[PDB]
Amino acid sequence: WMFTRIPTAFLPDEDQGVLFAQVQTPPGSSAERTQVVVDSMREYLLEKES
Amino acid sequence: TGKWEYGSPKLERYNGVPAMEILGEPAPGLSSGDAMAAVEEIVKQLPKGV
Amino acid sequence: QLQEGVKQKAILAPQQGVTRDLKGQATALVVNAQNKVELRVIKADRVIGDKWLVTEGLNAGDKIITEGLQFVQPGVEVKTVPAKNVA
Amino acid sequence: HFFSFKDAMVFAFAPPSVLELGNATGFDLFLQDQAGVGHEVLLQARNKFL
């Protein structure tokens, strides 16, 4: 009965010290809007989660 | 003259025929076979030709 | 620089809120008076400054949306806020 | 908090355990055509899948 309960995977998602963030504005946009979103993300990750 | 039209900025191909990707991840409790089977139920409701 | 015509009572939709649909005709999402977005087709063909010279479709006093137009679909209740994105 | 960025669609993801396999976690599949049904029909089919 217990072999059906525990789910099967390949290899557990480990910690790496690496996080990615993928910025994507409403497209058909210029570089100013993407730069604003990027700079606000940098300000958040540097002063709020240092 | 000039006409505004419609198109994608990133065109993809796979084995010599056009394509689009779909990335994702399964539920926090479910296995990989259940996500496999769920994609196998979603693909059956696609149009004929893909 | 010889001028060709003075447009009286002109409305200027910004570059952020005007896009194209599947056919090539310009659109802009506006918010109704009962606070719900919808699609509307406008005729914008001249860029003056960084704002389209909209000649038809939009009116005076309506509220087009410039950011958050991929978090929204036509026909769902939203909340208004002054858009800080435009300049 | 990246959902609170009302401007852009920001998605934050962590890389998998084995970095050599790919660049994110979970599965992936390439929705392709075979007959030449059309780029717009394939984009509509991808939106239906999503």
Curated annotation (Swiss-Prot), chain A:
Q: How does it assemble?
A: Component of the MexAB-OprM multidrug efflux complex, composed of six MexA subunits forming a hexameric tube, binding to a MexB trimer, which interact with the trimeric OprM outer membrane channel protein. OprM is thought to not directly contact MexB; instead, MexA joins MexB and OprM by forming a funnel-like hexamer anchored to the inner membrane. MexA may initially form a hexameric ring complex with MexB prior to OprM, then OprM undergoes a conformational change as it contacts MexA, allowing the periplasmic gate to open.
The subcellular localization recorded is: Cell inner membrane
| Name of the gene encoding the protein in the UniProt record | mexB
Species source reads: Pseudomonas aeruginosa (strain ATCC 15692 / DSM 22644 / CIP 104116 / JCM 14847 / LMG 12228 / 1C / PRS 101 / PAO1)
In terms of superkingdom, the source organism counts as Bacteria
Description of the deletion phenotype? Disruption of MexA, MexB and OprM significantly reduces active efflux of N-(3-oxododecanoyl) homoserine lactone/3-oxo-C12-HSL/PAI-1, but not N-butyryl homoserine lactone/C4-HSL/PAI-2.
- Name assigned to this protein: Multidrug resistance protein MexB
Further details from the record: Pyridopyrimidine derivatives, such as ABI-PP, are not exported by the MexAB-OprM efflux pump, bind tightly to a MexB hydrophobic pocket and so potentiate the activities of antibiotics such as erythromycin.
The free-text function statement in the UniProt record for this protein reads: The inner membrane transporter component of the MexAB-OprM efflux system that confers multidrug resistance. Functions as the major efflux pump for n-hexane and p-xylene efflux. Has been shown in one study to be involved in the active efflux of the autoinducer N-(3-oxododecanoyl) homoserine lactone, thereby playing an indirect role in quorum-sensing; but has been shown in another study not to be involved in efflux of this autoinducer. Over-expression of the pump increases antibiotic and solvent efflux capacities. Implicated in the secretion of the siderophore pyoverdine.
| Induction entry | By growth under severe iron limitation.
The similarity annotation says: Belongs to the resistance-nodulation-cell division (RND) (TC 2.A.6) family.
- What does UniProt list as this organism's lineage? Bacteria, Pseudomonadati, Pseudomonadota, Gammaproteobacteria, Pseudomonadales
UniProtKB/Swiss-Prot annotation, chain C:
Record note on what altering residue 20 to A/D does: Abolishes complex formation and thereby decreases drug resistance
Location in the cell reads: Cell inner membrane
Q: What's this protein's name? A: Multidrug resistance protein MexA
Source organism per UniProt: Pseudomonas aeruginosa (strain ATCC 15692 / DSM 22644 / CIP 104116 / JCM 14847 / LMG 12228 / 1C / PRS 101 / PAO1)
Name the UniProt key words of this record, in alphabetical order.
Antibiotic resistance, Cell inner membrane, Cell membrane, Coiled coil, Lipoprotein, Membrane, Palmitate, Signal, Transport
Section covered of the full-length record? 281 to 367 of 383
Q: Name one GO cellular component term.
A: efflux pump complex
Q: Which protein family is it in?
A: Belongs to the membrane fusion protein (MFP) (TC 8.A.1) family.
Q: Per its record, what triggers expression of this gene product?
A: By growth under severe iron limitation.
**An annotated Gene Ontology molecular function:** identical protein binding
Q: According to the record, what happens upon gene knockout?
A: Disruption of MexA, MexB and OprM significantly reduces active efflux of N-(3-oxododecanoyl) homoserine lactone/3-oxo-C12-HSL/PAI-1, but not N-butyryl homoserine lactone/C4-HSL/PAI-2.
What binding partners and quaternary form does the record give? Component of the MexAB-OprM multidrug efflux complex, composed of six MexA subunits forming a hexameric tube, binding to a MexB trimer, which interact with the trimeric OprM outer membrane channel protein. OprM is thought to not directly contact MexB; instead, MexA joins MexB and OprM by forming a funnel-like hexamer anchored to the inner membrane. MexA may initially form a hexameric ring complex with MexB prior to OprM, then OprM undergoes a conformational change as it contacts MexA, allowing the periplasmic gate to open.
Q: Which cysteines link up through disulfide bonds?
A: none
* Record's miscellaneous remark: In both X-ray crystal structures approximately the last 100 residues are not ordered.
Give the protein's function: The periplasmic linker component of the MexAB-OprM efflux system that confers multidrug resistance. Functions as the major efflux pump for n-hexane and p-xylene efflux. Has been shown in one study to be involved in the active efflux of the autoinducer N-(3-oxododecanoyl) homoserine lactone, thereby playing an indirect role in quorum-sensing; but has been shown in another study not to be involved in efflux of this autoinducer. Over-expression of the pump increases antibiotic and solvent efflux capacities. Implicated in the secretion of the siderophore pyoverdine.
GO BP field: protein homooligomerization; response to antibiotic; transmembrane transport; xenobiotic detoxification by transmembrane export across the cell outer membrane
